Amino acid sequence: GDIRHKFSNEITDDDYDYQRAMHVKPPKEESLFQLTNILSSVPVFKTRFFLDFIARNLDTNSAVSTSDFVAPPRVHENSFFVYHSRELGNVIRKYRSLESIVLPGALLTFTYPLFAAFVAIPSYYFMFNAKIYEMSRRFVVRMDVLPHLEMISVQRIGAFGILYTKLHRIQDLEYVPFDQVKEQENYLWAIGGHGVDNQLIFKDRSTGEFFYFERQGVWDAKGLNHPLLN
Amino acid sequence: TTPRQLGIDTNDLKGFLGEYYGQYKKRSGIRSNFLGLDVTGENSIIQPNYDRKNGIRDVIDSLNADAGKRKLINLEAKNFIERVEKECEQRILKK
Amino acid sequence: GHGAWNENQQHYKYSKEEIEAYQVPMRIKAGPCVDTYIPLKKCFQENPTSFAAKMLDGRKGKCAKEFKYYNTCLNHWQTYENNSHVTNAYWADTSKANADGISNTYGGSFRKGLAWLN
Amino acid sequence: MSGLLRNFEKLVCQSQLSKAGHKLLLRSPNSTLHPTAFYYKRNSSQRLANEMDVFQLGLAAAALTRQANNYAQLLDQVDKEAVREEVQERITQNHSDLNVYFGE
Amino acid sequence: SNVDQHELKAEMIKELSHYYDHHDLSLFGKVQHFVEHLLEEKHHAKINTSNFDQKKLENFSESKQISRTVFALKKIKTFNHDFFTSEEEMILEPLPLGILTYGLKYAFAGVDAALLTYFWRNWNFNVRTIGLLGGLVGIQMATLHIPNLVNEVVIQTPRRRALAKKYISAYGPQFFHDIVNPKYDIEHLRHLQNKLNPY
Amino acid sequence: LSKYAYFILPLIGSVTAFYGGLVSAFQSDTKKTLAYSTISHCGFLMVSYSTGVLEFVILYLYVHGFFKAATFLCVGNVNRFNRNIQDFKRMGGFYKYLPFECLASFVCMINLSGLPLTLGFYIKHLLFIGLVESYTLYPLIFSSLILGAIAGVFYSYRLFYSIFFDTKKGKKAIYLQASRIILNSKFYSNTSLASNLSITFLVLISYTVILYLYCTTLNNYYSLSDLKSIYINNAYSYFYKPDYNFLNAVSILNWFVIILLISVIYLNWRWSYYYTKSIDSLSKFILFSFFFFIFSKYIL
Amino acid sequence: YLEPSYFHETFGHMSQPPKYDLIDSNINGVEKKLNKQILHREHNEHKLDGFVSMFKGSDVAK
Ligand SMILES: CCCCCCCCCCCCCCCCCC(=O)OC[C@H](COP(=O)([O-])OCC[N+](C)(C)C)OC(=O)CCCCCCCCCCCCCCCCC
Ligand SMILES: CCCCCCCCCCCCCCCCCC(=O)OC[C@H](COP(=O)([O-])OCC[N+](C)(C)C)OC(=O)CCCCCCCCCCCCCCCCC
């Protein structure tokens, strides 16, 4: 289908190579100034000092997951875990941790803390509260079941990243269809509800508190099949 | 926020502001005809009204008042600096 | 030397005919810096320069001797026009300004924004 | 996980978590794994039986009994009578609450 | 007899510094400003110059003479601003900093900010990391001075020496030696006029 | 010397600015968006004339005309490629098919819509410098002006992103007819070489002329020709020697624009594989900005 | 680079990289000390003179 070879003055892949920065193509050759080429050529990086620095001073392999099955430490000696959040929980934790550094730092650094607060207030109330904060408040970091109490312990991220666990009776749990809450909280689901599952929302009737479960969260087959939850 | 200092330049009072009042002071539009005809101003559909105080008069008066206020502020600042200098000189002398 | 900010190096006041000759825009003619502006314009006319050079030169190159006087006069003119020398003092210390009123006329109505409560 | 000029010897390896029955207990801040005081209502607008369940009443009764026993030990180990009056009043209140809850 | 100008100016400074020498600072900025004012240099209204008399001009080896003439030119410029032309003023001033210096400073700031962000996010705070941060900040602060020193020692220095030689030829060593001597009348220095300036 | 002009020009100008800006921001068609942006800029021009700095009015007129023309040409090329469909709801992934148009539109839009560190920021800055405060309806005038000024960001972002870098929403034929390998050649292009050269030269000349006007007017040495007007507004005082009050007041609008930019950038309206990583990137940006400011101001 | 006004009015004046001349290093000893003190006094007096001149010169233009 290509007829570029029929003309001697036609453009060539050698001419198109400059588009590899703006265009994704599999590698063809390594330039002299690439990081890989520089590291493999310069003998300094081959030094055992640099090699040991790379080996030690960086992300460790211990924290790297090694299996598709995860058994987190039991919250209680008699409880068994059911659900756990991997990435969104960590992201929310880090985001809420900013309240322990930016806020005191902002107070002690900004020339006009009142101006900063006046700017932040409407920012929080529009496009931020429903965006992240309410979703985090209703987010379930981890869920375990205590059979002796016939209860469920739910872990949540609080202000400044503090983690707190609360107990809810299984008899007080109900399923809230997304249709009953979409109109009430359209904005929340509009801008911040993407991370959590829309159709798997539960709430505690006694306390009227919701439970949002991450879409990319790990569930335990045994926990789901346990007779207490069925 | 607080209101800003805006108005006609204090160095150009003789001009846009000056001519506006100068016209009403001159009242040149109701002078006698050069040929001696009994006709004069106020005898046409478009006629002068030099006893009028509406229209842009309010805006001109506001601009003039603002310019005067700014000049007064500058004069008060000058008096303040002179007084501070005099007080410092007196304190130095009385030691 | 030792002249006021409105006077120029030569202490020469230009007449109306001279202003018309070295025609000055009404924007400048309204202010008090005509005497310091005219020498700068004459220097620029004698040594024309590109707009890029004017923008990129912080000392106006050749026409620096007159530009010093012109800049001083312009600073004084704008400061007195906007009453910024008093407004900045009140902003820096409203309480002290009221204690020893720099200008009661401005002090009685000045009110810094609640956001700027340094 | 990530660090610079740091050693992660004390870190729990993911191999143990992947393994089942690893015998690991989690201690986290602000963890309340006991429902005591959840259903303890000092003043009830109606009968406690109507509003609460046998489980809740039993939890409240056990908590009250433990507190009353501890205050009885306080009475036993305390000498001054004036200080003992507060302990006696607290014990009486706990006994009344326990009696009503157990009757329900 | 008459009120001393230096004493009057010192009193006026004490009275009016709050207006023309005050900015808006945060709590940390105010604390730093307080520390600086504690470890400041007092505004000596009067300086006793009757103890150091002079040094004989013959002592210098005609290079210290040029350096002292450079200092005299700086003093003249500081006291009266109409003495020197635009080019001479530019020569006497420190050479303005450039894109290289500014980009180096902001790259240092960026790397430091990235390191702090990483440390906070991973909770990687310890003695070694704190020491590394301190050392890196100190090295960056020391390096930020290097461009200015290089400029002053390479470009400005020969130009200032040439200007000093020109002015020595114009006036004579004893004039700038007298100016260098602190007993020189500051009012006379202010009212001094430059032969080499067309004005 | 017109009382009616004094009362009518600022109010109508500000109302038109707000209306046009918001309608353009909410608009979905390229030509309609440009038309409503033109209405908003006409309102801003009226407000500037009410302020009474003819130099500022001329600068605003020049900037708006040049960059509006350039953006109109770019969107015309986009529409011609999209087969006369001017709505960008059927436009997606056009960055590769119209490479020149993408970057030209980026530059033209950042200049047109008043954005920080752009040639079009100074016109709005001078307008707000010269805005008068003796108006009886000053509250409404100022609020409308602020809303209209901020509205530029939304329409610029929507137009640029939806036209070029959004998911492919157009008909399959539009992409397939041009993606055929047979078309691969040194002459391949979805636009005209003459069109590209004309747009490039227009942008260059507009930049040069705007710089010339800025040097003529806003420089310390005023070198503009006589305007044949004897009315002096004193607005240049706040451009030459601004006070702390106004310097901090402008920061309010600057930070409003900053927050709106952050919203249009980091706000998610649809589920994506990058939701969590986007939140993480927002956190990283916030913390890094804080630390960078700390080091720049205090630690050096 | 050449128009940092936006940065100044949006983030404030950041710390400026060092900029100074080594002319004072030419002289040494009591001479250097006295000259440095005189220069510092002159700088302070110049700032005060500028402030007072700005305040006083309001009536220069008649
Ligand atoms: C009109 C009234 C106006 C009022 C305005 C009020 C403004 C001021 C608001 C103050 C907010 C105070 C926030 C406290 C944050 C801690 C909360 C808490 O207990 O959380 C524990 C949390 C969580 O504790 P944890 O127990 O869950 O776990 C410990 C930490 N991890 C999770 C990592 C294991 O811990 C922290 O976040 C510790 C933070 C320590 C550092 C705090 C200060 C940092 C900023 C210093 C100043 C700025 C930088 C200076 C740099 C100088 C360089 C030379
Ligand atoms: C006193 C009560 C507590 C107040 C807490 C502080 C507000 C809430 C937390 C704000 C965190 C974000 C700080 C970003 C600082 C950026 C640098 C800066 O200008 O700091 C000094 C300035 C203030 O320092 P300043 O007061 O010395 O500045 C001089 C005064 N101005 C600027 C007005 C001329 O910071 C701000 O202006 C911050 C305003 C409040 C922001 C509120 C949240 C909206 C932004 C979302 C986060 C991402 C913002 C990214 C910005 C990137 C750059 C445009």
Ligand SMILES: CCCCCCCCCCCCCCCCCC(=O)OC[C@H](COP(=O)([O-])OCC[N+](C)(C)C)OC(=O)CCCCCCCCCCCCCCCCC
């Ligand atoms: C209360 C404090 C005083 C200030 C009062 C005013 C409050 C703020 C009012 C902001 C109104 C902004 C309206 C923008 C409309 C844009 C419409 C558009 O093009 O489509 C949406 C486009 C997106 O278009 P899109 O094409 O990407 O997708 C559209 C998707 N649908 C149709 C489903 C919605 O942009 C946005 O989504 C952004 C707008 C929403 C977020 C607004 C955040 C406001 C933050 C305010 C910060 C205030 C700081 C403090 C100081 C303020 C005063 C100085």
Ligand SMILES: CCCCCCCCCCCCCCCCCC(=O)OC[C@H](COP(=O)([O-])OCC[N+](C)(C)C)OC(=O)CCCCCCCCCCCCCCCCC
């Ligand atoms: C086949 C030929 C095709 C046409 C070729 C035309 C080429 C034009 C190239 C330059 C165009 C863009 C110029 C820069 C943008 C405008 C800048 C501006 O406003 O001016 C600032 C400056 C003005 O000067 P200044 O801004 O540097 O300041 C002057 C300083 N004072 C005031 C003190 C004197 O102008 C320019 O730089 C523009 C160039 C000068 C004017 C040239 C006009 C005569 C042209 C002669 C060639 C004729 C060719 C005929 C071909 C016929 C074909 C049929």
Ligand SMILES: CCCCCCCCCCCCCCCCCC(=O)OC[C@H](COP(=O)([O-])OCC[N+](C)(C)C)OC(=O)CCCCCCCCCCCCCCCCC
């Ligand atoms: C790398 C890709 C991602 C980058 C995205 C952008 C990140 C923005 C983060 C903002 C955080 C909040 C504000 C804190 C910093 C405020 C800086 C400021 O106001 O300085 C203006 C300053 C004000 O300086 P000034 O006021 O002293 O005077 C400038 C004028 N002259 C030169 C005549 C003295 O303007 C500058 O000169 C800025 C630096 C220009 C040169 C930079 C070269 C590259 C440096 C390395 C890259 C740095 C990237 C980070 C962003 C840099 C922005 C300039």
Ligand SMILES: CCCCCCCCCCCCCCCCCC(=O)OC[C@H](COP(=O)(O)OCCN)OC(=O)CCCCCCCCCCCCCCCCC
């Ligand atoms: C005995 C031996 C002693 C040896 C002593 C010396 C040792 C070497 C010291 C220097 C080198 C340190 C090691 C190299 C890696 C440093 C990485 C770093 O600084 O953090 C990157 C961090 C990544 O994000 P993070 O949230 O931390 O995710 C963790 C992923 N593992 O980044 C972030 O958090 C994001 C920050 C950026 C946010 C958006 C802005 C983008 C631009 C940032 C540029 C920063 C880099 C510098 C350039 C500045 C100018 C642009």
Ligand SMILES: CCCCCCCCCCCCCCCC(=O)OC[C@H](COP(=O)(O)O)OC(=O)CCCCCCCCCCCCCCC
């Ligand atoms: C005058 C106030 C000025 C601003 C003060 C900011 C304080 C920040 C620290 C707050 C610490 C306590 C948090 C409590 C959370 C909770 O569970 O709060 C829960 C409660 C209850 O909410 P409900 O009534 O809806 O259930 O929150 C409230 O009642 C409202 C308080 C909101 C606090 C928001 C804190 C984040 C601010 C973000 C600003 C914009 C973004 C800035 C950049 C990242």
